Scaffold this active site. Structure first.
Site, mmCIF file in Angstrom:
data_model
loop_
_atom_site.group_PDB
_atom_site.id
_atom_site.type_symbol
_atom_site.label_atom_id
_atom_site.label_comp_id
_atom_site.label_asym_id
_atom_site.label_seq_id
_atom_site.Cartn_x
_atom_site.Cartn_y
_atom_site.Cartn_z
ATOM 1 N N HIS A 314 0.363 -1.688 0.086
ATOM 2 C CA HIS A 314 -0.275 0.273 0.055
ATOM 3 C C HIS A 314 0.859 1.414 0.046
ATOM 4 O O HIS A 314 1.583 1.669 0.835
ATOM 5 C CB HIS A 314 -1.061 -0.303 0.716
ATOM 6 C CG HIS A 314 -1.545 1.304 1.079
ATOM 7 N ND1 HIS A 314 -3.551 0.586 0.529
ATOM 8 C CD2 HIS A 314 -2.071 2.469 1.569
ATOM 9 C CE1 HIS A 314 -3.729 1.823 0.499
ATOM 10 N NE2 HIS A 314 -3.411 2.917 1.223
ATOM 11 N N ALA A 315 0.693 2.225 -0.747
ATOM 12 C CA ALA A 315 1.708 3.081 -1.579
ATOM 13 C C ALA A 315 1.657 4.036 -0.077
ATOM 14 O O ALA A 315 0.698 4.426 0.541
ATOM 15 C CB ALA A 315 0.854 3.854 -2.070
ATOM 16 N N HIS A 344 0.531 11.737 -5.731
ATOM 17 C CA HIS A 344 -0.371 11.949 -3.629
ATOM 18 C C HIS A 344 1.185 11.641 -3.173
ATOM 19 O O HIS A 344 1.744 13.083 -2.523
ATOM 20 C CB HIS A 344 -0.891 10.826 -4.103
ATOM 21 C CG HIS A 344 -1.956 10.300 -2.239
ATOM 22 N ND1 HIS A 344 -2.851 11.345 -2.043
ATOM 23 C CD2 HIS A 344 -1.076 9.864 -1.206
ATOM 24 C CE1 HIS A 344 -2.922 11.484 -0.678
ATOM 25 N NE2 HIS A 344 -1.833 9.913 -0.615
ATOM 26 N N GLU A 345 1.893 10.835 -3.198
ATOM 27 C CA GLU A 345 2.867 10.301 -2.462
ATOM 28 C C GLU A 345 4.286 11.908 -2.421
ATOM 29 O O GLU A 345 4.673 11.956 -1.361
ATOM 30 C CB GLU A 345 3.213 8.706 -2.427
ATOM 31 C CG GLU A 345 2.470 7.999 -3.033
ATOM 32 C CD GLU A 345 2.872 7.917 -1.046
ATOM 33 O OE1 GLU A 345 2.266 7.718 -0.539
ATOM 34 O OE2 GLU A 345 1.131 7.230 -0.640
ATOM 35 N N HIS A 348 3.065 14.274 -0.720
ATOM 36 C CA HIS A 348 4.435 14.028 0.963
ATOM 37 C C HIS A 348 5.582 14.696 0.949
ATOM 38 O O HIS A 348 5.865 15.144 1.829
ATOM 39 C CB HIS A 348 3.862 12.768 1.588
ATOM 40 C CG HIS A 348 2.198 12.570 1.715
ATOM 41 N ND1 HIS A 348 1.132 13.326 2.320
ATOM 42 C CD2 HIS A 348 0.901 11.061 1.249
ATOM 43 C CE1 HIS A 348 0.145 12.521 2.587
ATOM 44 N NE2 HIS A 348 0.305 11.342 1.444
ATOM 45 N N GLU A 372 -2.873 15.448 3.340
ATOM 46 C CA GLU A 372 -3.380 14.385 1.433
ATOM 47 C C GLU A 372 -3.421 15.007 0.257
ATOM 48 O O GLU A 372 -3.470 14.469 -0.340
ATOM 49 C CB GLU A 372 -4.576 13.599 2.323
ATOM 50 C CG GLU A 372 -4.192 12.334 3.546
ATOM 51 C CD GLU A 372 -2.837 11.446 3.526
ATOM 52 O OE1 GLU A 372 -3.416 10.953 2.401
ATOM 53 O OE2 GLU A 372 -1.824 11.345 4.976
ATOM 54 N N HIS A 474 -6.882 0.720 5.779
ATOM 55 C CA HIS A 474 -6.399 1.924 6.368
ATOM 56 C C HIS A 474 -7.219 0.974 8.023
ATOM 57 O O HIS A 474 -7.148 1.662 8.770
ATOM 58 C CB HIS A 474 -7.497 3.459 6.389
ATOM 59 C CG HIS A 474 -6.797 3.820 4.886
ATOM 60 N ND1 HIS A 474 -6.543 2.933 3.830
ATOM 61 C CD2 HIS A 474 -6.041 4.990 5.225
ATOM 62 C CE1 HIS A 474 -6.120 3.705 3.195
ATOM 63 N NE2 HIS A 474 -5.810 4.841 3.195
ATOM 64 N N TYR A 484 -9.264 11.753 4.138
ATOM 65 C CA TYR A 484 -9.034 12.122 2.078
ATOM 66 C C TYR A 484 -10.335 13.049 2.636
ATOM 67 O O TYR A 484 -11.141 13.105 0.896
ATOM 68 C CB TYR A 484 -9.188 10.393 2.238
ATOM 69 C CG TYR A 484 -7.992 9.858 2.354
ATOM 70 C CD1 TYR A 484 -7.182 9.502 1.924
ATOM 71 C CD2 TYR A 484 -8.013 8.978 3.605
ATOM 72 C CE1 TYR A 484 -5.640 9.448 2.487
ATOM 73 C CE2 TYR A 484 -6.763 8.047 4.613
ATOM 74 C CZ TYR A 484 -5.762 8.383 3.401
ATOM 75 O OH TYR A 484 -4.567 7.742 3.846
#
Ligand SMILES: *[C@@H]1O[C@H](CO[C@@H]2O[C@@H](C)[C@@H](O)[C@@H](O)[C@@H]2O)[C@@H](O[C@@H]2O[C@H](CO)[C@@H](O[C@@H]3O[C@H](CO)[C@@H](O)[C@H](O)[C@@H]3O)[C@H](O)[C@H]2NC(C)=O)[C@H](O)[C@H]1NC(C)=O
Ligand SMILES: *[C@@H]1O[C@H](CO)[C@@H](O[C@@H]2O[C@H](CO)[C@@H](O)[C@H](O)[C@H]2NC(C)=O)[C@H](O)[C@H]1NC(C)=O
Ligand SMILES: O=C(N[C@H]1CCS[C@H]2CCC[C@@H](C(=O)O)N2C1=O)[C@@H](S)Cc1ccccc1
Ligand SMILES: O=C(N[C@H]1CCS[C@H]2CCC[C@@H](C(=O)O)N2C1=O)[C@@H](S)Cc1ccccc1
Ligand SMILES: O=C(N[C@H]1CCS[C@H]2CCC[C@@H](C(=O)O)N2C1=O)[C@@H](S)Cc1ccccc1
Ligand SMILES: [Cl-]
Ligand SMILES: [Cl-]
Ligand SMILES: [Zn+2]
EC number: 3.4.15.1
Length: 586
Positions: A314-315, A344-345, A348, A372, A474, A484
């Site tokens: 999971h990323a 998305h990543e 962060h 996020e 999650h 989210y």
């Protein structure tokens, strides 16, 4: 005295950097290499960081933050007074850490096997079945099989997890773990604010749902789709029916305006996972934002290992709390969906770099939704047909109202469909934590919410022993979800504001902020605050005002709302699921 409190926070910062960096390393080493040895080391480092949290938290609770004049010191100290699970007695702390690791490992190693055949993992195998299969029974096999193997296996752990996370929350002055989680937003009106935002998105969601339901009726057959009922949950292209864009082929508004197969274009042009992250890096630096450090490219895990290691796919994005070492761990597949995830990543990582010089206690997003949201904002621009054509992943699609509505539909299938899913996950968990939902009713109450909010039904009736929430990452990993929902709302507010700062005119959905230094500056000023100020200040720096608002998302999708209302009216759709008790006959 102000002086003893300032010295305390300086000591906390120095020692936390060291301990948190060690814990992060052990956690990374397990997540990227699941073995008995790496699990044992991780559990040991867990006790080490707990000892530090207890030592400094006990000290922090000796300060009356009332008497403290400096607001930044007061804010850090108040935070350090929360011991989290280090408040637990030693035996319960060890039990909690083991339960959390057992749940996480169970989810990440679960497989679904054909009789005397191949065994499929979630990433990539089951994800690809859900995305590409168009056969009801094959989708059902993957959907049910994943819940049977991953969800049912989490149930044995979940009640004790709830007991222990709640016990820790009460020892830190909250009423339950959901109260603790909601407090991250420092917003007393949070529940009312989120409900109002959800209600504003209902016209769009109900119209999208009815249109997709009609298209599913056309493909899967009238005997399998009730035009006045909920949609079977395995037909939306995604294991959780949380985003629907993989069924674009079934619902395309204007089939006479087709789009280039983006997966085949990426493959034919030699895209790799590394290229995907490099393109995201280029978008950030085009805004004048920071490049990822050389170390990121050496240390990250950007594709699933081929060497026999088992990993958590999971990323996710990782801050090692030394101002230098930041990493992504993602089992990247070469397609457009994962290009969005890569952005998305990378958002962060950008946030980590922007706030790296704050005290560690303030190295978080303005609220968890802001963290996020950052990468998703840039991915809105990447996703425009103009930008994708510049990457040679689409043909030219401009100058065509048919292509325009098609694009808006592609975007809505992800961004609008996700609104009710992201709302419901922690509505369920908050009521588990507050005791309103017991282990007797976990699964029934989950499905009541899936019906109430998403208008979905399970294709196979659930049985006692099912624990479908456990089949969503999650839940076993204890990662809050309302972040989210917040993210999907505010990312459109950010897009709107950055597009205005960049001088874009015309419809919001045509904006591409690539290369805008004015847009980058808005984001950087907000990200540099970390968690040092109430989140409305960061909202103000980006958007010129302090509230969360659905207006930007509604503006983005207004042409599609108009198209959907006309289309649904033409076909006589009954919005919603007034036949709410309908479930599949076969
Ligand atoms: C309340 O206290 C904060 C925190 O002060 C900092 O942390 C304490 C624990 C002590 O170690 C202090 O010595 C330490 O400064 C004050 O915030 C800080 O204010 C200073 C002064 O403006 C900021 O300095 C800047 O630092 C950057 C580089 O980081 C320079 O380029 C700038 O030119 C400038 O010198 C510092 O960033 C800031 N720190 C934080 C975390 O906000 C705050 O001023 C104080 N409040 C009042 C009313 O005095
Ligand atoms: C995956 O984890 C195993 C277990 O920790 C690693 O094997 C250890 O490697 C270290 C240093 O390479 C040795 O000191 C230990 O003796 C090894 N233990 C065992 C049980 O073999 C392995 O190197 C890791 N693999 C990767 C790719 O990181
Ligand atoms: O969200 C997260 N961490 C949250 C989990 C939900 S609760 C919340 C509020 C109370 C104190 C503390 C607790 O867990 O007890 N806390 C967390 O650590 C992770 S993903 C990201 C993050 C890491 C470090 C700091 C902040 C965010
Ligand atoms: O957020 C994350 N990973 C993404 C990857 C896919 S995209 C994205 C947006 C849609 C909603 C959500 C979804 O897929 O459920 N989501 C994710 O989970 C990570 S950083 C959360 C995390 C943080 C720290 C440790 C472990 C995990
Ligand atoms: O960051 C997170 N979770 C933190 C919450 C703050 S405390 C921290 C330190 C002590 C050990 C452990 C604990 O006690 O739960 N722990 C957590 O799980 C979640 S959101 C993200 C995440 C999930 C899974 C793997 C990696 C990251
Ligand atoms: Cl489910
Ligand atoms: Cl959250
Ligand atoms: Zn994330």
């Amino acid at each position: 005295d102000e002086a003893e409190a300032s010295k305390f926070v300086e000591e906390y910062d120095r020692t936390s950097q060291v301990v948190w960096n060690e814990y992060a390393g052990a956690n990374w080493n397990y997540n990227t290499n699941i073995t008995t040895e790496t699990s044992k080391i991780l559990l040991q480092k867990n006790m080490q960081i707990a000892q530090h949290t207890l030592k400094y938290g006990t000290q922090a609770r000796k300060f009356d933050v009332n008497q403290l004049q400096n607001t930044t010191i007061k804010r850090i100290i108040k935070k350090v007074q929360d011991l989290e699970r280090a408040a637990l007695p030693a035996q319960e702390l060890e039990e909690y850490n083991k339960i959390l690791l057992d749940m996480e490992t169970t989810y990440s190693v679960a497989t679904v096997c054909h009789p005397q055949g191949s065994c499929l993992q979630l990433e990539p195998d089951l994800t690809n079945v859900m995305a590409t299969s168009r056969k009801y029974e094959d989708l059902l096999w993957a959907w049910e099989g994943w819940r049977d193997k991953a969800g049912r296996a989490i149930l044995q752990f979940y009640p004790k997890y709830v007991e222990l996370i709640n016990q820790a929350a009460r020892l830190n002055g909250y009423v339950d773990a959901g109260d603790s989680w909601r407090s991250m937003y420092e917003t007393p009106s949070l529940e009312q604010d989120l409900e109002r935002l959800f209600q504003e998105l209902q016209p769009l969601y109900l119209n999208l749902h009815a249109y997709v339901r009609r298209a599913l009726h056309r493909h899967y057959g009238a005997q399998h789709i009730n035009l006045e009922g909920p949609i079977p949950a395995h037909l939306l292209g995604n294991m959780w029916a949380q985003t629907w864009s993989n069924i674009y082929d079934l619902v395309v508004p204007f089939p006479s305006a087709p789009s280039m197969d983006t997966t085949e274009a990426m493959l034919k042009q030699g895209w790799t996972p590394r290229r995907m992250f490099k393109e995201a890096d280029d978008f950030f630096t085009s805004l004048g934002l920071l490049p990822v450090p050389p170390e990121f490219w050496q240390k990250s895990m950007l594709e699933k290992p081929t060497d026999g290691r088992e990993v958590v796919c999971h990323a996710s994005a990782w801050d090692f709390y030394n101002g230098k070492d930041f990493r992504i761990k993602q089992c990247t597949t070469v397609n457009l969906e994962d290009l969005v995830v890569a952005h998305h990543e990378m958002g962060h990582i950008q946030y980590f770099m922007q706030y790296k010089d704050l005290p560690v206690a303030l190295r978080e997003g303005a609220n968890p939704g802001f963290h996020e949201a950052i990468g998703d904002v840039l991915a809105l621009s990447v996703s425009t047909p103009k930008h994708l054509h510049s990457l040679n992943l689409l043909s030219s699609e401009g100058g065509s109202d048919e292509h325009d509505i098609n694009f808006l539909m592609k975007m809505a299938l992800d961004k609008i469909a996700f609104i009710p899913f992201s709302y419901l996950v922690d509505q369920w968990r908050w009521r588990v934590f507050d005791g309103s939902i017991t282990k007797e009713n976990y699964n029934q109450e989950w499905w009541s919410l899936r019906l109430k909010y998403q208008g979905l039904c399970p294709p196979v009736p659930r049985t006692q022993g099912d624990f479908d929430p456990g089949a969503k990452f999650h839940i076993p990993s204890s990662v809050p979800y309302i972040r989210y929902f917040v993210s999907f709302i505010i990312q459109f507010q950010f897009h709107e504001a950055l597009c205005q700062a960049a001088g874009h005119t015309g419809p919001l959905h045509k904006c591409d902020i690539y290369q805008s230094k004015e847009a980058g500056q808005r984001l950087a000023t907000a990200m540099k605050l970390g968690f040092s100020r109430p989140w409305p200040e960061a909202m103000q720096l980006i958007t010129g005002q302090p509230q969360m608002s659905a207006s930007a998302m509604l503006s983005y999708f207004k042409p599609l709302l108009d198209w959907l209302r006309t289309e649904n009216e033409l076909h006589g759709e009954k919005l919603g699921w007034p036949q709410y008790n309908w479930t599949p006959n076969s």
